[PDB]
Amino acid sequence: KENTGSMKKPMAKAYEHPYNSEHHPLNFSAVKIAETFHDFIGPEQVSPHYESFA
Amino acid sequence: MWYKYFSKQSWNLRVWRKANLKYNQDDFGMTQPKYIARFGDFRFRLVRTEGALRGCMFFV
Amino acid sequence: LTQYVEGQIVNRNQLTLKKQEDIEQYVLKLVRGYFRTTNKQGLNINSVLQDHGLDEFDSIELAMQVEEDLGYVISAETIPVLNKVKHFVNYINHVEQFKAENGKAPIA
Amino acid sequence: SLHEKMQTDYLWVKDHSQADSWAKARTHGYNYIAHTVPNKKERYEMIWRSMGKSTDWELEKFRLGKK
Amino acid sequence: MNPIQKAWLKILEPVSYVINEKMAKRTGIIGKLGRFFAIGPREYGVHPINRMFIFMNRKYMAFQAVALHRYSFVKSLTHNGFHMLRVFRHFAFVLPATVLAGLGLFVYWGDDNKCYSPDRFPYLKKRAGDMALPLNSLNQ
Amino acid sequence: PLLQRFYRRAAANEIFTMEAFYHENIENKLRNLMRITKGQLEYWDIHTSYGEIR
Amino acid sequence: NPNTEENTIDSDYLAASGTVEAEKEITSIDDYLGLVFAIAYVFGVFFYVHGWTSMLSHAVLLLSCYSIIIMFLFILGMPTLLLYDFGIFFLAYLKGAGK
Amino acid sequence: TLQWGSLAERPMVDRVMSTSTWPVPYYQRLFKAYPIREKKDKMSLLLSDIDIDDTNWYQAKDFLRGSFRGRQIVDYV
Amino acid sequence: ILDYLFLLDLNDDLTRKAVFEQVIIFIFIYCTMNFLAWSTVVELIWPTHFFNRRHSSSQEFIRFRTYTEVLLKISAYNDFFYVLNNYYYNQKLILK
Amino acid sequence: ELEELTETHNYIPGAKDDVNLRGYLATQFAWGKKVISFYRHPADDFKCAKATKNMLGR
Amino acid sequence: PQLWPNPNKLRFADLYKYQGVEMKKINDSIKNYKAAKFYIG
Amino acid sequence: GYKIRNKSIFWTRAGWKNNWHPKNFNAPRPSYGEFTMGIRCRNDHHSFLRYVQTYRNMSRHCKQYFLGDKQLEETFILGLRSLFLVPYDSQCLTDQIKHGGERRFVDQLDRDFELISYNTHPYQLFTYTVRNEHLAWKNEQYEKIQKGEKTFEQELLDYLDEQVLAEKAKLRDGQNFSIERMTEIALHVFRKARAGKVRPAQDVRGPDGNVNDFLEQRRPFEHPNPTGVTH
Amino acid sequence: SQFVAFFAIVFWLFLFLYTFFIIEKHEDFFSKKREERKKKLKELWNLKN
Amino acid sequence: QMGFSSDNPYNKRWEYKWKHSYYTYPRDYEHTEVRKPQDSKDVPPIYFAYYKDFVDRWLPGMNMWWQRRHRIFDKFNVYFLPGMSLFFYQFADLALGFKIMAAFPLFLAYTRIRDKTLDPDFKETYLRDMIYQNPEITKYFNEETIHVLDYEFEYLPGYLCPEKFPEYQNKTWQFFNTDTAQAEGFFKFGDVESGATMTLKFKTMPIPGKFRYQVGEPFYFYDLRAEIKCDGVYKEVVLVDEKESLKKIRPFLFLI
Ligand SMILES: CCCCCCCCCCCCCCCCCC(=O)OC[C@H](COP(=O)([O-])OCC(O)COP(=O)([O-])OC[C@@H](COC(=O)CCCCCCCCCCCCCCCCC)OC(=O)CCCCCCCCCCCCCCCCC)OC(=O)CCCCCCCCCCCCCCCCC
């Protein structure tokens, strides 16, 4: 009886906000600022060497 | 059922026009003296309160 | 007068009960439809909504659905007294008699 | 029980007779701190632990007392 | 990758074929030279200036939202909405006015952009070859 | 001494430890929630044997 | 990491210590917090907080000279708006009943 | 100790290696690299120690309704 | 056309007051100063929020689910969570 | 949730947290040791004022 | 999985149509530039 | 693991763990009618009905953007109640708050509805994003079932049902197949399955102490110059 | 000393003399809901959460 | 009648009482039913917050003054105070003292217009406490089961019958007032438990109390009548009768 199970068609999509995006989020938080901050200073400049530069 | 949650301890005052009507103006203030004449009686009769009278005479 | 139903727009229908028997059957169908209601078959005219897993906030969702089906405009001062099935029935009669005598809807 | 038994024991918590005459550090280490050493965080833990023993881990006595 | 990099590719499409296919693998020095000037996705091609703007734009904008989102000084005068005693209501529109004034930060930057510079002394020095002049040169 | 700035280090140094022991602290909170859950599942193991007992 | 960088540690706990004083019930912290920033460049001269403003103008104490005037005008208006809030009875709030 | 050496060789004393390889790179990693802000298939870690609530039986019905025997259990309950 | 537009003049502002050219300098500094102060206050609420929401719970009290924790549990579950629930159901509620 | 605190201007850390543990750690040695009241908004002002027969509302 | 682009083992045509996360950001910015035509105009 | 050692952590000048009435100098004092001339106060008895109407608006205004998704309306309702039940279940004595907690929470909820009326509340945008990510995965399953193909979720359910038979077919000495055994069987399948996927590195450190990032490329140097695109 | 006396008088003391907070309340429906809400969770507490 | 009313459909008799904490006004008025995303207008037009404050705060405030304008057309507001303002306006350039004496009678007029145009608010908590003390009302009505169907309360225009209230035939009081300050209205109540309904008709007038110059209660019910109606029972309750209440206390006759 369980093997006879079928599935219902779900909704196609929910509401899509026309003024909110991943790169231009509508609301503000320190999380997005941190994402842009680390894009600016770039990744951790890992030294592959055995000794420090100085 | 808002009256169920209304606290009757707010009946200590009867606020009307920013004034408490349960104020013994007959025993305290410019209105306590009962030897006041026709002008002083007609003056308080208009304003009903020394606070409003003093405030207006402040600018006059 | 249209609403989305599972992503599809559907025309909304308004009901006119004007009968005590139709009111009891409507409210029961209404409460049994609410996903928070327990013992849907044990529900009767004298059933307390608190005894079926409903709180004050669930009585609001029910009233919100009465405005959808009947077109009523219920004030917030009337909702918190709807705590039984019998209460929804008597309120509906008071609204129909008021419109039949005063010629207007109750104050919202 | 054994934990409280030894806490109350006078012998287990008793300054030696000459303890009064000895030189006593009257600071927990919060006056001059090492800020750039790799054990920086380990140093703070010993300051925090010293402040707690003085107050039985009731730091309200420290807030009220004199620094 | 951005459109300007793609534009370079269509223009350098034949050049890439000569360096990456022929020179980059021929032999010896011609290989080291072709593999050094190879054409492809930019290694460390990020532009920190672009990112610097994106960060400061976002950080300064979060400040605009705070400074501009204030309770009204006019509505607090009636003592009927949300505000009975507000002894510093006259400070409500200081930060908003301060942010709107920030729109002229770059429009009016330096002395030359705030007045008619030819009527000012520093203009004479620039036309004299950035040379010191007596302070009364504008009169003589 | 004016130990205000020190008080801000001691608290940050203490939070540094609570974050390092996040997995252990949370895992112990669930050990008690799992105990409650396992206790309620004992009622189902009893009913599944009633048919055999009968 | 807000637990290792002493720069965000100092600023975070300092701000929390400043906003928590709203329980002192002075007035809306959302209103007078901006005046605190201005008053800080008046009395912060004792601690050289105005240092970063040395190249922003020909007067190193420009922001401090304006803030002292701002500090004076808005503090001068705090009593005036308080009487406006009392209404026409404002004299009874101060002295009480006449004699 | 408080005497670790010269200022130039200060970043040398930080590395601690888990293997016997020589020479050893000196740089000690501070953070984990996170170049792409990817939506994690991982479930949120807030759902950690939340006591039983209404969301437990609402999700049980949704999962039970996916079976024939579960649809009977829900309707009868 | 009105004389009010005369305020747009800066070539001959030295004939009336010569004050605008100096006051906006302060206004630009005042905005910069507030930008650093307010941005620090409003941004630095995240360390407290990040810590309390992850360490403030205790076993002698009930932790109540928030709005976000409701949506994530019901509308953001992964495949393993769906499998584990039905895996437990089929084995114990159906197959015992 | 952090956006909700920001967009509602609830920028007092720990106001909406029932147990502001971060607030207790920062006030372990503070003068007038206190934590923010629950759901305190930086804009609300419940100040009152009254006029009595005596001065200063006494 | 293994068809993911590699900056070394890359074709010219593929790099011209890469359309990575960098472009995805730009396309969001462009959506604002277009929507601001009436406000700026 | 680690416990707070300071016993006075939750102490305040007002008492233990008091976040409802902090101690301040200007404390509340009573008022007497016979001596009070006038008063300026904003307190009232309208918070109860404002709490009711606020719930109805936040619910009805958020449902505008659910597109008739019944499962979303019910999930959102459970989340909306969790936001209104905070004062009823909190440790904070919301009935003893300084100047009236009822008025405080109502005014705080009103600020939320203001954002909801504009469809700008983070919970709204969070709801749309979370739901779209869910329906995309449910439609992927539906399209695979209509094609007669088997879903990744069913392959595990079927692969787990047989693994249980193999374990209980040999567990004859005992016959108590606990939920613990059933659990560690699934986890062994999830770890193996998850590891098979090409997922981004989540843990800082892999089997070795070294970090699993693209930056953890140290000596020795063995990589040549980078090569260009191929034609 | 003068720094403290300035703010301790212009703001702290000045407002303590001419402003106050009332002790009387107009609505107390939170107190009675927490009691009823606690009875709805009586069983969950019985499990010691 | 409620003077302060916006296009908002809910809570009409509470619109002026409720003080919302909104920074600005909501995008759309409170919805009476669930709507569609396209039923509303995203990103409302520019200067929308200023438009709402005019049509939701200013306009309903001016409609109140216009609805009750018949209460401010007295000889004191119309002729005395403006004429006193003009006498000193001719000398406003001589000194500052004339500017004050020319603006004071105008601020005083605004205060009387402000106070007189507000909706008459009685102490409803005194009323409900009064009816819930009567056993004939509590037999069918309880606060936990009562709901309001209609509410009307407005001032009475002009002077009343100069035999029931001879007080208002005073030329000195008429110089300050053109109305009576009395109000009349009703209350449509319903009980969801017993199904009972009643119309609580009442009349009010200001009275003096315990003092010489100050009013005791601006809205004192000197007539309070309830026509209770139930399933098949009709009762008429008289909590306060005017024939017996007007023999003990008289109106106050506000001045200024
Ligand atoms: C016409 C021809 C002209 C052009 C010719 C072309 C060539 C020109 C030269 C260009 C050189 C480029 C390549 C070298 C650049 C980096 C050099 C360096 O030392 O950095 C390594 C060092 C770490 O390297 P590492 O050995 O691999 O250790 C890695 C650890 O993570 C490190 O952290 P750790 O804690 O684990 O280890 C300890 C740490 C210890 O070091 C630190 O952690 C911090 C060091 C202090 C930083 C400086 C703070 C100054 C505050 C700002 C004030 C000045 C701003 C400049 C502008 C002012 C306005 C003019 O670093 C060290 O190991 C030892 C430090 C070595 C000395 C550091 C100080 C160097 C001077 C930097 C400031 C230069 C400007 C002021 C000079 C006077 C200006 C006229 O990094 C830094 O020092 C960063 C600071 C900024 C460096 C770049 C600044 C610009 C170029 C500086 C050249 C220095 C010589 C000239 C000035 C000296 C005058 C006394």
Ligand SMILES: CCCCCCCCCCCCCCCCCC(=O)OC[C@H](COP(=O)([O-])OCC(O)COP(=O)([O-])OC[C@@H](COC(=O)CCCCCCCCCCCCCCCCC)OC(=O)CCCCCCCCCCCCCCCCC)OC(=O)CCCCCCCCCCCCCCCCC
């Ligand atoms: C000279 C320069 C002039 C320059 C003029 C410049 C232009 C001015 C124009 C503008 C005028 C200002 C506008 C005022 C109105 C504004 C509204 C207002 O403020 O409210 C009215 C305001 C109300 O007064 P209040 O103080 O609030 O009332 C007090 C109580 O509430 C009242 O309590 P009560 O009502 O219950 O009873 C009051 C009274 C009971 O009173 C009554 O019952 C009497 C009622 C009689 C009514 C009369 C009816 C008449 C009817 C008309 C005639 C019948 C019609 C016939 C028609 C015939 C046709 C031809 O009971 C008493 O026993 C009172 C205490 C005893 C009197 C104390 C007097 C102290 C004076 C000390 C100085 C002594 C000087 C003596 C030697 C002087 C020789 C020159 O009136 C005044 O303020 C009056 C002015 C006060 C200023 C005092 C400062 C000056 C000190 C006196 C001068 C000292 C001499 C200095 C130089 C000497 C050089 C030789």
Ligand SMILES: CCCCCCCCCCCCCCCCCC(=O)OC[C@H](COP(=O)([O-])OCC(O)COP(=O)([O-])OC[C@@H](COC(=O)CCCCCCCCCCCCCCCCC)OC(=O)CCCCCCCCCCCCCCCCC)OC(=O)CCCCCCCCCCCCCCCCC
């Ligand atoms: C209610 C406000 C009172 C205002 C008083 C007016 C100001 C008086 C100034 C006197 C100078 C010393 C000041 C000591 C207090 C320092 C507190 C402090 O700076 O904050 C640290 C404090 C936390 O740091 P902490 O290290 O944990 O505090 C404990 C102390 O470090 C150390 O902890 P502790 O337990 O060891 O000490 C507890 C503390 C308790 O303080 C109180 O409870 C205040 C009680 C009233 C004032 C009593 C002292 C008044 C000065 C007497 C001067 C006598 C001169 C005699 C001259 C004789 C020769 C002719 O200090 C005392 O006990 C004072 C006793 C004085 C005994 C003197 C012994 C004999 C000395 C004779 C030699 C004379 C040399 C004079 C040379 C000039 C001075 C160097 O920050 C806060 O708590 C923030 C809340 C601030 C409270 C309200 C404002 C009070 C003023 C503080 C400065 C403004 C703070 C905001 C700055 C904003 C920047 C972003």
Ligand SMILES: CCCCCCCCCCCCCCCCCC(=O)OC[C@H](COP(=O)([O-])OCC(O)COP(=O)([O-])OC[C@@H](COC(=O)CCCCCCCCCCCCCCCCC)OC(=O)CCCCCCCCCCCCCCCCC)OC(=O)CCCCCCCCCCCCCCCCC
């Ligand atoms: C160079 C200059 C330097 C000076 C700078 C000063 C700047 C100050 C800025 C402050 C803000 C001013 C703006 C005022 C806004 C007013 C808005 C308004 O109208 O709302 C009404 C509002 C009253 O409403 P409420 O109190 O909320 O409630 C009223 C009750 O419901 C009412 O209850 P009720 O109905 O029972 O009361 C009865 C009636 C009682 O009234 C009476 O007392 C009656 C008086 C007698 C009338 C005459 C009777 C005549 C009888 C004739 C009888 C004829 C018989 C005929 C018989 C017929 C025979 C057939 O009371 C009233 O209705 C009147 C109250 C309102 C009076 C407002 C007076 C404002 C005068 C301002 C004039 C100057 C403004 C210049 C602005 C310039 C701006 C550029 O007015 C106020 O609240 C006034 C507050 C103002 C306080 C400001 C204090 C600030 C400090 C100033 C001096 C500082 C000196 C130290 C300087 C230090 C350097 C900084």
Ligand SMILES: CCCCCCCCCCCCCCCCCC(=O)OC[C@H](COP(=O)([O-])OCC[N+](C)(C)C)OC(=O)CCCCCCCCCCCCCCCCC
């Ligand atoms: C660094 C760059 C930026 C700096 C910006 C400024 C940051 C300031 C940091 C916060 C300072 C907060 C000071 C609060 C002091 C409160 C102490 C306290 O609670 O009293 C407890 C005290 C002491 O109790 P206690 O238990 O807390 O401490 C005991 C202290 N010992 C240990 C020494 C015994 O008791 C009282 O209640 C007395 C209250 C007196 C309050 C007088 C201070 C009033 C000043 C504040 C008002 C200023 C408003 C300015 C607005 C301006 C607007 C234009």
Ligand SMILES: CCCCCCCCCCCCCCCCCC(=O)OC[C@H](COP(=O)([O-])OCC[N+](C)(C)C)OC(=O)CCCCCCCCCCCCCCCCC
């Ligand atoms: C002769 C030259 C004219 C000189 C210029 C005079 C300018 C007059 C207009 C600008 C000033 C308006 C007053 C602003 C201060 C009051 C703020 C406010 O609006 O609060 C409203 C308040 C609203 O009450 P509230 O603000 O206390 O809040 C109510 C309760 N809540 C918050 C819960 C909703 O109502 C009033 O104040 C009463 C109405 C005010 C009347 C203002 C004057 C309007 C004049 C209309 C002129 C019509 C004829 C001429 C024009 C014809 C048009 C074609």
Ligand SMILES: COC1=C(OC)C(=O)C(C/C=C(\C)CC/C=C(\C)CC/C=C(\C)CC/C=C(\C)CC/C=C(\C)CC/C=C(/C)CC/C=C(\C)CCC=C(C)C)=C(C)C1=O
């Ligand atoms: C509106 O509200 C506000 C914000 O929004 C929230 C803010 O972010 C901010 C913060 C502002 C910032 C963070 C930006 C700060 C910018 C500053 C300080 C100056 C930046 C300077 C540079 C980036 C250097 C530029 C150098 C030059 C222009 C000199 C050489 C000339 C160049 C490069 C361009 C050539 C000139 C031309 C006229 C040709 C133009 C060419 C084009 C348009 C081609 C475009 C091509 C494509 C593919 C788009 C404020 C103040 C604000 O008020």
Ligand SMILES: Nc1ncnc2c1ncn2[C@@H]1O[C@H](COP(=O)(O)OP(=O)(O)OP(=O)(O)O)[C@@H](O)[C@H]1O
């Ligand atoms: N006991 C009190 N203590 C302090 N302030 C008070 C008190 N009573 C009233 N106030 C203030 O006076 C205002 C007006 O009081 P009022 O009785 O007219 O309100 P109300 O809503 O009409 O009451 P009711 O529903 O009984 O008619 C109130 O909004 C309040 O701010």
Ligand SMILES: [Mg+2]
């Ligand atoms: Mg009333």
